Design an enzyme around this catalytic site. Sequence first.
Site, PDB file in Angstrom:
ATOM      1  N   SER A 197     -27.083 -25.124 -49.900  1.00  0.00           N
ATOM      2  CA  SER A 197     -27.668 -23.786 -49.828  1.00  0.00           C
ATOM      3  C   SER A 197     -27.826 -23.210 -51.245  1.00  0.00           C
ATOM      4  O   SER A 197     -28.484 -23.825 -52.080  1.00  0.00           O
ATOM      5  CB  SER A 197     -26.788 -22.887 -48.951  1.00  0.00           C
ATOM      6  OG  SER A 197     -27.515 -21.762 -48.481  1.00  0.00           O
ATOM      7  N   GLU A 324     -32.314 -25.452 -39.899  1.00  0.00           N
ATOM      8  CA  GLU A 324     -31.880 -24.567 -40.976  1.00  0.00           C
ATOM      9  C   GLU A 324     -31.990 -23.082 -40.619  1.00  0.00           C
ATOM     10  O   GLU A 324     -31.146 -22.278 -41.018  1.00  0.00           O
ATOM     11  CB  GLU A 324     -32.715 -24.823 -42.244  1.00  0.00           C
ATOM     12  CG  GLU A 324     -32.646 -26.239 -42.796  1.00  0.00           C
ATOM     13  CD  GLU A 324     -31.366 -26.523 -43.555  1.00  0.00           C
ATOM     14  OE1 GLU A 324     -30.444 -25.677 -43.526  1.00  0.00           O
ATOM     15  OE2 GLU A 324     -31.281 -27.599 -44.183  1.00  0.00           O
ATOM     16  N   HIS A 437     -27.505 -24.749 -40.436  1.00  0.00           N
ATOM     17  CA  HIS A 437     -27.457 -24.646 -41.885  1.00  0.00           C
ATOM     18  C   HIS A 437     -25.989 -24.781 -42.272  1.00  0.00           C
ATOM     19  O   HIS A 437     -25.131 -24.086 -41.720  1.00  0.00           O
ATOM     20  CB  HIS A 437     -27.981 -23.269 -42.309  1.00  0.00           C
ATOM     21  CG  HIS A 437     -28.120 -23.087 -43.790  1.00  0.00           C
ATOM     22  ND1 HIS A 437     -28.979 -23.845 -44.560  1.00  0.00           N
ATOM     23  CD2 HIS A 437     -27.563 -22.180 -44.632  1.00  0.00           C
ATOM     24  CE1 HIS A 437     -28.951 -23.407 -45.808  1.00  0.00           C
ATOM     25  NE2 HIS A 437     -28.100 -22.397 -45.878  1.00  0.00           N
TER      26      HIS A 437
END
EC number: 3.1.1.7
Lengths: 529, 529
Positions: A197, A324, A437
Amino acid sequence: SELLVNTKSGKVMGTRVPVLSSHISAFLGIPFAEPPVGNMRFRRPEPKKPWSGVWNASTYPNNCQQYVDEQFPGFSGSEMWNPNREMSEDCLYLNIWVPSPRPKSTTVMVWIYGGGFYSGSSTLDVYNGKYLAYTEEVVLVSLSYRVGAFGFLALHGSQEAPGNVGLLDQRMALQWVHDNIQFFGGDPKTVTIFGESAGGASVGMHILSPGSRDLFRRAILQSGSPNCPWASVSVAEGRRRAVELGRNLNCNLNSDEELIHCLREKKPQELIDVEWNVLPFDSIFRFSFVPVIDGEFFPTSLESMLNSGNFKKTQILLGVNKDEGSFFLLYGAPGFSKDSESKISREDFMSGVKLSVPHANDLGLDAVTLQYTDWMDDNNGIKNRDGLDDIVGDHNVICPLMHFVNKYTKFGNGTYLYFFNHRASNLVWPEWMGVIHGYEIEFVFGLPLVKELNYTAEEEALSRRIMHYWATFAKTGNPNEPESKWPLFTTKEQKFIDLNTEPMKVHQRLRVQMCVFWNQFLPKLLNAT
Amino acid sequence: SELLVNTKSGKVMGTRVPVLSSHISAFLGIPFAEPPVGNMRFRRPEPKKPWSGVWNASTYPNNCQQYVDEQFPGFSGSEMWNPNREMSEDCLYLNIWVPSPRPKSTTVMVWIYGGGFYSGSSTLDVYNGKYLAYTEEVVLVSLSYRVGAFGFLALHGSQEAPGNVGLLDQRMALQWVHDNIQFFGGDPKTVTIFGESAGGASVGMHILSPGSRDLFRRAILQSGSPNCPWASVSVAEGRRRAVELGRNLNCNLNSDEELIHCLREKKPQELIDVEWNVLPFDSIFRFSFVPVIDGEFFPTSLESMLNSGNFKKTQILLGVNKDEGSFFLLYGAPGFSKDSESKISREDFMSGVKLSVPHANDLGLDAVTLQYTDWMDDNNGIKNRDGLDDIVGDHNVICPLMHFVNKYTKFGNGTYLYFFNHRASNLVWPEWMGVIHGYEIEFVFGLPLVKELNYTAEEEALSRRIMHYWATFAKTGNPNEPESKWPLFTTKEQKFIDLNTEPMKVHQRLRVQMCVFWNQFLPKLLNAT
Ligand SMILES: *[C@@H]1O[C@H](CO)[C@@H](O[C@H]2O[C@H](CO)[C@@H](O)[C@H](O)[C@H]2NC(C)=O)[C@H](O)[C@H]1NC(C)=O
Ligand SMILES: C/C=C1\[C@@H]2C=C(C)C[C@@]1(N)c1ccc(=O)[nH]c1C2
Ligand SMILES: C/C=C1\[C@@H]2C=C(C)C[C@@]1(N)c1ccc(=O)[nH]c1C2
Ligand SMILES: *[C@@H]1O[C@H](CO)[C@@H](O)[C@H](O)[C@H]1NC(C)=O
Ligand SMILES: *[C@@H]1O[C@H](CO)[C@@H](O)[C@H](O)[C@H]1NC(C)=O
Ligand SMILES: *[C@@H]1O[C@H](CO)[C@@H](O)[C@H](O)[C@H]1NC(C)=O
Ligand SMILES: *[C@@H]1O[C@H](CO)[C@@H](O)[C@H](O)[C@H]1NC(C)=O
């Protein structure tokens, strides 16, 4: 003693930790910078002054001051990401896991956490480096850096709050590793930085920034790219958000000096309490204080840097997860709930599109809606939900990463792309969220090898396979053992592989149809209109 | 005598013609207007002055002056559409096929030919009405009207060349039918007008125009709609093309009177020779002289008329063919050839897009290209060819028709939609062209029933089925016999059926995904940019 290491900054005493019926050394909470407290808040970091005596590195350090997720009190799915140590502005420390017996000069991997530049802790259970260090015989390092306003408030032109200081914290930790990892048995010329991320965007930013390039050898980016729409802002927007933050705390706004002074007198929680009020648009997957294109850390715009090949040329390994976007829709989009199937109406879908592409005009919103709508069944709740999931994932993670990989591969020395699509058997999040995610992390760090965690044998096998890919790549620049081969990603064939419990399969042009829309068409449309 | 009919304009003598081992009456070449020759060229038509004696209606009349297709000399595929009778400005005649013995008051069907308003003949072999008249016991009429500059040169404001006169020719023929068909055994209160391509657009234009509505009962539109992008132009564009035509013939352009006088002194072939030089853009599926939104024949813009329900409310039956675009790509797009598979390169594809959407800016062209490109295989010659085929068909025929059907159905009394996707077994055109524009006509007119034509038994069955659908609809307003049922098209379910040799199948939302793009998105994009 194996738990005693003399570094250039002083001696440190580690602790022996058990792992998979064995043991290794851990040096937790090693300081790499002077506490960025007081008049230092918002300032560039300072190297830690050497110390006499022995530094006790037996326990985890404090976590940086940050927003704490309380959307689901008591729920492990969200709380496993919150700080698990007391928070404090005195948080610039790093952790090192060293194989036992201590290696002489082995592969080094440095982890960079990344919750949208507003959150993150190097001490999360999912970041326990003992499994990877032990299983792959690598020296595993996890650094830390200021997040939120503390690490990214930006008043360009001012030297008191120049912005990007959180990135500089990362750089200082990498400098420390480069200078001292040899004493822990690590080879400073074979350091791979990897993060997920914002940590993934960070890795790419170190690849781009001239001042960071010489500090590492290779890079791994997970669900994050430097060019992500949420990863940076202009010097002007950064300034606007800084002033707006001051406005929220009744600060004198006559000058940068006045604003900064006021912000420095506020307690940490006071800044965190109003942090989210400075965003320019009602949106999701957008964070307040992030890196700024300042002309210093980033010489020019990211796109011109990517286009001119102005970046570190080496090997990279990166990829994305199947869903995601689900996490961000749950926390902020109408119609989504953690305990329902979240079937979305046609109207909530439109609201979702608006929140997902805040910077778009009506024509842009229509283009997106058209692109992700099945007009032969536009009122299908599941298709609307999955459509939004893809919109958020493609726009914020996948397509920006694909743009980066294609631009990078033109000048790079080797690219390996993956698509992680395995939903863990023990997830507590609803099924509609899919492969979330951040959920490939537990496999990268080897949690599945821990029986008590209830993973399946197939998941343990997947973890080992991924860990060996990551470690072999860090060591040689190629994830493949000198088994089915992970093909090299080339500008021409654009191959990649899937990462799941099924027999590896090679594919091509990852979501190319959608990414051409997000990377080529939509930008052109918004610019023409 | 059965071959003698006294009409309000005078007596006419027909001829007995054989058909499928039987016979019927045919009254060919009946005049319905004064020859639009000399000072009448470009003028509104005048009713034919009644005559004494008996008019010989035993042979086909002349065809109107028009461009003759010589792209493939000797090739039947293209020549079967060219005029098969001497051309002449004295061409306003109609043909009638009457069952034997003569009916008293039966269903009437009036055919309107339609080659882009620049071509067409009521005498083509494929328009022989004896098969339909005989098989379904209907009085079949085929009219004629001026095409090209002769029928559509438009200098709005002038009464010498007001434009739309070709449409007025059609109207005069319908008026004649309404006034005299009763004497041939036809019921003037049960007249169905039907046409293909520009003939289909014409039918819709009579549905819209107040002055034509009371002249017929029902309508059938084949591969053509009044709102097609090629079916009409503004009064300004019409004037521009008229002046440009004069410029091509070295005409004095000081005044409408000067221009018209000059154009009237030119021989027919001189106007035809330069007809195509007046188009504003390099393009395909665009014709020079077409109907004009004049505020008279068309009170207001077509879209506001469709939106306000300002049109004849009755039942309609309409549809399209699978590959409407192939024919036009062959005649004008780079990369296409009649004797090759016409696999298209990525570059010719882009050239095709440009020619297909002439009025679009670069952003618009990109939108189209993106919408019809398979980015996982963008250099596939067959996919590029088929993609262009769909672009041309969707933009010029299918989507405009779907917009019309949805707007009409909101106020209409019954809609029946079809999708013709059977490629005749005896076609001489290459296979890549598929189910070509205009090739459902031979089935509607029953040519497959003629053994010598080499159709299969299944194709004969299809023809009979289609003829019975058309005739039953014309008679009752419902194609279904009071067998699998052709469902009614509704705003809600939007059902339609396929027309082929396989068991009928009902579908929904005909190419809705693409049509939303062409009817909603692209127009909005071109308007915003
Ligand atoms: C990565 O870089 C290396 C070296 O720059 C490339 O391999 C080279 O190997 C030798 C230098 O160490 C040279 O003698 C070779 O000519 C050169 N390789 C070739 C065939 O050009 C290697 O190809 C690069 N890898 C990628 C994927 O770009
Ligand atoms: C964008 C925000 C994130 C990302 C994914 C999750 C699930 C939570 C998050 N707040 C978080 C919190 C702490 C952390 O170390 N990483 C991440 C990554
Ligand atoms: C748009 C032009 C057309 C259409 C299809 C064909 C195949 C030829 C054409 N010139 C033609 C010529 C004569 C005619 O009667 N109809 C048509 C319909
Ligand atoms: C610090 O080290 C001491 C031993 O010197 C020991 O108490 C423990 O490991 C550390 N103290 C803490 C944080 O409890
Ligand atoms: C494994 O399963 C047990 C019992 O079902 C559960 O209580 C425990 O939380 C799981 N393991 C973990 C991750 O704690
Ligand atoms: C016109 O009618 C006559 C008979 O009166 C006959 O010669 C033929 O049917 C027609 N003439 C032509 C066009 O040959
Ligand atoms: C039928 O087939 C014959 C011989 O193959 C061919 O010559 C003829 O043209 C076909 N029928 C038609 C349409 O003329």
